Amino acid sequence: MLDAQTIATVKATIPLLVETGPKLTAHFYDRMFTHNPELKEIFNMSNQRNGDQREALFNAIAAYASNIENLPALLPAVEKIAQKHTSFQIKPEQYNIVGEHLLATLDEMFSPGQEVLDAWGKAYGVLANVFINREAEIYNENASKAGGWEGTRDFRIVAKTPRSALITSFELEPVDGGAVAEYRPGQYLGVWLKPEGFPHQEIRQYSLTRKPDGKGYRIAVKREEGGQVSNWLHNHANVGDVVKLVAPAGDFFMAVADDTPVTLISAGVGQTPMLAMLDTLAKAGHTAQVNWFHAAENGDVHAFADEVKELGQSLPRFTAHTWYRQPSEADRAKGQFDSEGLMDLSKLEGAFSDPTMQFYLCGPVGFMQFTAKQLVDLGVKQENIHYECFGPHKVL
Amino acid sequence: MLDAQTIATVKATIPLLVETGPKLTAHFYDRMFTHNPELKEIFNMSNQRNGDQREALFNAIAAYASNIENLPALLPAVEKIAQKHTSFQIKPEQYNIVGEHLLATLDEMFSPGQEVLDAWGKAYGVLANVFINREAEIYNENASKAGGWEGTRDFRIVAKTPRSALITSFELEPVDGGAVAEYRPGQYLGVWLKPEGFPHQEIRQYSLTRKPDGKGYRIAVKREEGGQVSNWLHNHANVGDVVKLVAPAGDFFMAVADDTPVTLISAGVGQTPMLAMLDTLAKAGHTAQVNWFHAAENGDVHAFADEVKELGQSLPRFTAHTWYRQPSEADRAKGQFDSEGLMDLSKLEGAFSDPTMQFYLCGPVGFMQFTAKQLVDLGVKQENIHYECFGPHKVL
Amino acid sequence: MLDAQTIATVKATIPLLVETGPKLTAHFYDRMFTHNPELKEIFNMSNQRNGDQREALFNAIAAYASNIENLPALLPAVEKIAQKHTSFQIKPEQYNIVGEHLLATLDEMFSPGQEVLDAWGKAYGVLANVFINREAEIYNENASKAGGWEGTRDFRIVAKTPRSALITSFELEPVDGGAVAEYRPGQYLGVWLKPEGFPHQEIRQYSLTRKPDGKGYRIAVKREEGGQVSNWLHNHANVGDVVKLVAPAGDFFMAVADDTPVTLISAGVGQTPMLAMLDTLAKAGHTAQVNWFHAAENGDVHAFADEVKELGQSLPRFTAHTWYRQPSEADRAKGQFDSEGLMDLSKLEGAFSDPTMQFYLCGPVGFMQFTAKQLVDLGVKQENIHYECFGPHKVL
Amino acid sequence: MLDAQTIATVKATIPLLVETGPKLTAHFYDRMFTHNPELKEIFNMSNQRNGDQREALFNAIAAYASNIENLPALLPAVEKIAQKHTSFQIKPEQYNIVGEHLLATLDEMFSPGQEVLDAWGKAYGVLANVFINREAEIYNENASKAGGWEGTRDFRIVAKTPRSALITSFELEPVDGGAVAEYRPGQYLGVWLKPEGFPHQEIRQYSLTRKPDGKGYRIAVKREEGGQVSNWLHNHANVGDVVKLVAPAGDFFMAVADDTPVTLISAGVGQTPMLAMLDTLAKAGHTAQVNWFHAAENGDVHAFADEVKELGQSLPRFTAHTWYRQPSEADRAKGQFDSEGLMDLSKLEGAFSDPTMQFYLCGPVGFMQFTAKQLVDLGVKQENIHYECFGPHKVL
Ligand SMILES: Cc1cc2nc3c(=O)[nH]c(=O)nc-3n(C[C@H](O)[C@H](O)[C@H](O)COP(=O)(O)OP(=O)(O)OC[C@H]3O[C@@H](n4cnc5c(N)ncnc54)[C@H](O)[C@@H]3O)c2cc1C
Ligand SMILES: Cc1cc2nc3c(=O)[nH]c(=O)nc-3n(C[C@H](O)[C@H](O)[C@H](O)COP(=O)(O)OP(=O)(O)OC[C@H]3O[C@@H](n4cnc5c(N)ncnc54)[C@H](O)[C@@H]3O)c2cc1C
Ligand SMILES: Cc1cc2nc3c(=O)[nH]c(=O)nc-3n(C[C@H](O)[C@H](O)[C@H](O)COP(=O)(O)OP(=O)(O)OC[C@H]3O[C@@H](n4cnc5c(N)ncnc54)[C@H](O)[C@@H]3O)c2cc1C
Ligand SMILES: Cc1cc2nc3c(=O)[nH]c(=O)nc-3n(C[C@H](O)[C@H](O)[C@H](O)COP(=O)(O)OP(=O)(O)OC[C@H]3O[C@@H](n4cnc5c(N)ncnc54)[C@H](O)[C@@H]3O)c2cc1C
Ligand code: HEM
Ligand code: HEM
Ligand code: HEM
Ligand code: HEM
Ligand SMILES: [Cl-]
Ligand SMILES: [Cl-]
Ligand SMILES: [Cl-]
Ligand SMILES: [Cl-]
Ligand code: NA
Ligand code: NA
Ligand code: NA
Ligand code: NA
Ligand code: NA
Ligand code: NA
Ligand code: NA
Ligand code: NA
Structure with a gap:
């Protein structure tokens, strides 16, 4: 429950934040990955990435936290991000980590005094609670459905089909032989992978390609030149291998x-x-x-x-x-x-x-x-x- | 996107609003039903009602609209109400109606001047948009699922079973012979009724009593002494009759x-x-x-x-x-x-x-x-x- | 020559600008391309683009213009952008166009009153003059060198060599048979193209791959799946074809x-x-x-x-x-x-x-x-x- | 990153600075040369000088540092000075020296208190960083070119030709027998000299007189009555002697x-x-x-x-x-x-x-x-x- 001053203290520091744009973000991620390397198992560490996902995450925290009063207008963007976080299994403890690194970076870069850091801690906290609450509802919805589950579930690759020179489809069926959740056409799956050549666990989102049938899923992957996960799925993954999946999520559907x-x-x-x-x-x-x-x-x-x-x-x-x-x-x-x-x-x-x-x-x-x-x-x-x-x- | 003054203008009028508590609410509903009688087809008009649903709706608008800045903490209550509105098929046009009657009542009762009425119009508007946005997502989710639908759907009563002296279960199957939406155990259905003895169309919420099967639903109703809908279902409804249903909704599930x-x-x-x-x-x-x-x-x-x-x-x-x-x-x-x-x-x-x-x-x-x-x-x-x-x- | 108030008026509008982030940018580019479609011949219009270059340009104008007082610290970023603009042949008239669309968008989106729009017009103007001045120096340096030139120059493709399954090198020699400018290893060329299948003229930057020799240049292109210019160079361009080049530029060199x-x-x-x-x-x-x-x-x-x-x-x-x-x-x-x-x-x-x-x-x-x-x-x-x-x- | 007060503190001390005009400058150079005599090897110490270069340098620091906010308009003058400094091989350490003597002189002459001296230290610092950054780019450009070099390079006088009673041309070729940098017609060379009769090392700028040829340079000197360097080149320098040169620089070219x-x-x-x-x-x-x-x-x-x-x-x-x-x-x-x-x-x-x-x-x-x-x-x-x-x- 914020007040006018805290809100004005955060907005007053926004002009100082946009002119440090890229430096700031780099310092924040360099401090995060140094003290919390385990997050490398959730963020994309591929040498083929371009750094947009990182940039967007940080900018959203800065822009959303400073206009937390006008959250109402941000809810459609919050829903889209909350659905995506659900595939990456983001949790409340991780929001604490991102909060510690955000305030520590602000201090390290500017030494704004306690008042400013407290304000940013309160505005961020309110914002983090909004995401935690909606993501808790989605996790609950996913585990309540029939064939639904919490976390990650093992799925065997039961069929690998080349549909063109660049696209290959993969049929997946639960290793437990049980029912799988239904979904809304247009939604996607969270595929967690870490074969033995991967230095880190990578998570990618692949859309569901057919009507739900409560038995298995079928994803179609395009081989991206230099792409880590798509090239492993195309050149090394085989029928019989097991990958981990996170229930279907997504705000784009028909x-x-x-x-x-x-x-x-x-x-x-x-x-x-x-x-x-x-x-x-x-x-x-x-x-x-x-x-x-x-x-x-x-x-x-x-x-x-x-x-x-x-x-x-x-x-x-x-x-x-x-x-x-x-x-x-x-x-x-x-x-x-x-x-x-x-x-x-x-x-x-x-x-x-x-x-x-x-x-x-x-x-x-x-x-x-x-x-x-x-x-x-x-x-x-x-x-x-x-x-x-x-x-x-x-x-x- | 509100500002400090509008927000302070609304909070400053709250003490004037709580001391008029019941009068205010009555004037608001009396003005609503006079100019917008069609809403009698959505609100409960049974002579057996106690007036709590009305009281809660109005109080929530007053309390939520005046602390719209702290919306973050209100989201769990907003979700519960949004799920319920979905059964009653609340729409954006109706929010406009409730907004016109709220401001007209404030003026009629106090003559606060334009500044105050404008502030309340802006705070209410932001609040109404929050509900409209979430309810639009839920309507979309319900129509996207398999067997899901928009609005009201016709369902035939295919079985009427007395399970005790006070409870009778009713099996329902779509008149169109198609699949019905799945749901999360603990959720409910919106049953719209208006047999020929009803002066108005009544809508009631009945929980789903079994695991989903994509074919039909089974509700169990308790006969409430003097209750309009439960007594019609127990004494007049028969296998063969058709009622209208709204997809399953609800934030309480396992x-x-x-x-x-x-x-x-x-x-x-x-x-x-x-x-x-x-x-x-x-x-x-x-x-x-x-x-x-x-x-x-x-x-x-x-x-x-x-x-x-x-x-x-x-x-x-x-x-x-x-x-x-x-x-x-x-x-x-x-x-x-x-x-x-x-x-x-x-x-x-x-x-x-x-x-x-x-x-x-x-x-x-x-x-x-x-x-x-x-x-x-x-x-x-x-x-x-x-x-x-x-x-x-x-x-x- | 700005003053404290103008500068504070622009910084005071920054919090309003970051919370409209993407909307704002879209409105600005939609208004630009509608009234000044000729700019489609300079920006990348390929259906394969991801929209980052647009996003960065607009964000830089907002962040640089609002902290124009601290320009000193921005000069290294200004140099990098100025070198790139030189390949795209950006001119002073185009800065006027971008300025008209920026202020018109601010007005259209917020209706901030003349004071705010005037402030933004003055801060932008100062920023645009910084780029125009440095880019005028670079254009002059490029035309003063031996073999240097102003604008675009025609070059014939004299050799097409496949160096791998994805990379093909192209040797280029002036159609006029004269000397070509020298450059600093690590710099790039601006290649302007518009074969007959292109709906718009596209400009791409390709690095120079050998020590300068005052006779011709040699670029090596990777065929990007779906890439407009790289696929034309790999599948349709032939020895004998003529493309237009802009002198070598770039702040990254050995x-x-x-x-x-x-x-x-x-x-x-x-x-x-x-x-x-x-x-x-x-x-x-x-x-x-x-x-x-x-x-x-x-x-x-x-x-x-x-x-x-x-x-x-x-x-x-x-x-x-x-x-x-x-x-x-x-x-x-x-x-x-x-x-x-x-x-x-x-x-x-x-x-x-x-x-x-x-x-x-x-x-x-x-x-x-x-x-x-x-x-x-x-x-x-x-x-x-x-x-x-x-x-x-x-x-x- | 300065703020309004620092900027106003410096501008408020400007009227006090212009009325001490010449005294001030003298005190600054007398303190510089006493504690940092090595700078006599870079500034002109000839008894034939008139003191304009000193006067201009100091006045520019006072005028530029006090209007550092309006740096944008000063960039064309900054470029001209930065190009010249490059011939004299000015370095970042020397900016520190000039900064210490400027603030020490202000204190010694006025005893303005710490606030004023801190302000001037911050404004000067920002100004010194602007020059250091641009001069670092130019040094890099000069060492990146073919035949280019960092610092000073030895060149033998391979030809001495009298072109009139007052002008004699000198052809110069690297002692290392390698290629020499190209340049833009109208630019100049930095000639460092210190034959045995010189009490100090003198540096002079001589324009390049022909199109670049990557082999050597040709300068033409006018014998100035009483001039130190021109008279040494005309009366004592001989074919065979070696002088040091700094790469070609200058903002005036065709x-x-x-x-x-x-x-x-x-x-x-x-x-x-x-x-x-x-x-x-x-x-x-x-x-x-x-x-x-x-x-x-x-x-x-x-x-x-x-x-x-x-x-x-x-x-x-x-x-x-x-x-x-x-x-x-x-x-x-x-x-x-x-x-x-x-x-x-x-x-x-x-x-x-x-x-x-x-x-x-x-x-x-x-x-x-x-x-x-x-x-x-x-x-x-x-x-x-x-x-x-x-x-x-x-x-x-
Ligand atoms: C909601 C959602 C649904 C998706 N559904 C599918 C799907 O059904 N099928 C599918 O094949 N993929 C889908 N993707 C994309 C997919 O998740 C990944 O981008 C992909 O698997 C990347 O895998 P990686 O292992 O190759 O590479 P990384 O190492 O992350 O490589 C990314 C690669 O993309 C290339 N690339 C090409 N164009 C761009 C561009 N414009 N911007 C950035 N990188 C670019 C890079 O060159 C690089 O090879 C979806 C993504 C989202 C967010
Ligand atoms: C989420 C939700 C799920 C529900 N699921 C079921 C269900 O599975 N089965 C079911 O039988 N009902 C269920 N109900 C309740 C049901 O929707 C209605 O209250 C009911 O059908 C009222 O019907 P009516 O036609 O009799 O009477 P109305 O004319 O509205 O009469 C309401 C009646 O309740 C009586 N009553 C008894 N105790 C109270 C009390 N404490 N407060 C207010 N009135 C009281 C009144 O005397 C009166 O007869 C649910 C309600 C909600 C909100
Ligand atoms: C300073 C500079 C120097 C360059 N030097 C060279 C060079 O020497 N050789 C060379 O081959 N290219 C070079 N490039 C890149 C090149 O200019 C272009 O990106 C390229 O030619 C794009 O051409 P296009 O015609 O294929 O495609 P567009 O239609 O613009 O397609 C861009 C393509 O890139 C793909 N892509 C893959 N990964 C990414 C990613 N991470 N982000 C965005 N898109 C991605 C897309 O899928 C798409 O096919 C340079 C770029 C710069 C800025
Ligand atoms: C960018 C640039 C390019 C140059 N290119 C050349 C060039 O190509 N050829 C060339 O011969 N010189 C050129 N000069 C000038 C040259 O660098 C020096 O001024 C010169 O070599 C002075 O040398 P010095 O050794 O004689 O004398 P110092 O002892 O410094 O003597 C300077 C002398 O100039 C005399 N003098 C005559 N008129 C003036 C005047 N109006 N103001 C000040 N002193 C005056 C003095 O009487 C004195 O003899 C250039 C200068 C610059 C800044
Ligand atoms: C309140 C804070 C947060 C906000 C505002 C936020 C915002 C965002 C945004 C804007 C994106 C890009 C969405 C897009 O693809 O459309 C994103 C991606 C992501 N977020 Fe969040 N995020 C926040 C907190 C977190 C936390 C605590 C973590 C956990 C470590 C996290 C991990 C991720 C990951 C892994 C991605 C995907 C990027 C990748 O693929 O590398 N986020 N987030
Ligand atoms: C932004 C405004 C609104 C808020 C804050 C709000 C709040 C509420 C609350 C607190 C309840 C009781 C929830 C409970 O049972 O747990 C409720 C019930 C209800 N609301 Fe809303 N409401 C709003 C707008 C509307 C609108 C526009 C309509 C449409 C005419 C509407 C129609 C209803 C109905 C029909 C009920 C059920 C009452 C009954 O059974 O008679 N509400 N609402
Ligand atoms: C004072 C205003 C301006 C600033 C701050 C600015 C900034 C930028 C930035 C940050 C980038 C990305 C640089 C990167 O690749 O590293 C860029 C790219 C670019 N700018 Fe500028 N710019 C400005 C004005 C202009 C103008 C007037 C035009 C002319 C129509 C223009 C056209 C371009 C183009 C074509 C690109 C390349 C994007 C593409 O490939 O589609 N810019 N600019
Ligand atoms: C931020 C501070 C500085 C500014 C504003 C500045 C400005 C100037 C100006 C206006 C001139 C005359 C340019 C002309 O001939 O057109 C000049 C010349 C010169 N400057 Fe700088 N300067 C600064 C710092 C330095 C430093 C740190 C040194 C190093 C000791 C230095 C050494 C010189 C020398 C040697 C000359 C040539 C004078 C001579 O021939 O005796 N300057 N400077
Ligand atoms: Cl990334
Ligand atoms: Cl009621
Ligand atoms: Cl783009
Ligand atoms: Cl002098
Ligand atoms: Na990872
Ligand atoms: Na295809
Ligand atoms: Na009714
Ligand atoms: Na019972
Ligand atoms: Na184009
Ligand atoms: Na390679
Ligand atoms: Na000297
Ligand atoms: Na002459």
């Missing part, structure tokens, strides 16, 4: 009625949540129009085109359109794509004059901003457009 | 692992969420100890004793104890109960020395406060005790 | 004497500036120790190993060590690498006990922070470590 | 395209940077008009007229005009000059109606202000006029 037209836009592996959504619509006999717009680099790298076809065939009103950005000669001779180049919806055969249509988007940031702006230029309201990033959360 | 000992305490019809919890544990082969402590007035009114027996028999470590507060002569000659009188856990054979045991409670307020205080007097931590009221939310 | 031991650390294509540095040392007969530590994923993707060998052979004191993170069976049978796994300098044969040794680093952010922290853990002072990012600038 | 008309104005030895510019244009085949306007006292003292002729002959559009201020009888009989008297451009045959023409000027201050004002009176914009002083920097 919620429509039977008469709600839906459009699923995606580029490359960003089609994984869309597959779960398409499978769900097909198995439900969705009666309204369903569109599947996808862009792949070429036919070599394009995955799941056969599954998408059989699923749309089962729907009453379904339309699919694929764009190959750089079709090979063989691709042109097979004609397995509709248009070449970027996804130009504006040139499709017929627009979506249905105000009730809902659009889901998932690809790289430039792709989603280019494709979401085409939609509003066509008249689509922003509240009907939904999207998800496979990296830190962005906005357009 | 979330345990397989090795988490659980204790289910209940009095009378308060055993309904416990049945869903016991059925869930039994079907999961729960290995840790499971206790079923129940209190009924007598054998005539005691329901589900046979089901509870067969379910516990299927568990490895199960212990049941029943207390009849006023056993009849016939009850004593049948010996279908363990102890007579109030639920005195302190005299049971063996306490719960397991610090990891979780306790769920559900009965009238006096029963739950008497039984929860026995547990902490025995050493049980408060965070291991969970409970739910079948009326406005209370605290002990 | 500056050592003949007796200064040097260590060149790099991962993958990050070895491009190191090649220019190694070629320079070899042609100068560097007498002090020169180390070449490189990490590649495997032998298929490892490029320039033969060139590095012949160059080190020409040096008196040279030591090379290569780490393959995921050696293939064929790689192990050829033995063309020293160690497998991550670059663990701590396990090399002998440390760098030379306090005068200078270290240059270039790879992904995680790689450079992991490798730079190993060096200071070994005792290397931070001022002896130098590095460069192929994406926005980071810090560890 | 930066034009091939179609940029250029005008080179100069009086006497001020033609040295112009020769480097003319040689550069001639070797590049400059296609636009090139003018060479020069004024010498007479034919005896006029140097390089033959070189300028052969160079202009090699250009397509070249026009030369020479003015002898006091032609001798022999000069008039030879007709080796165009007009007699001062350089009156206004009476030339045809003006420069080309708005894109760039003008470079170099002679004494009166000559440059007289000649630059003629140009703007003719319509030439000020930003197209460039000039350099062979003494402290002035302005007209």
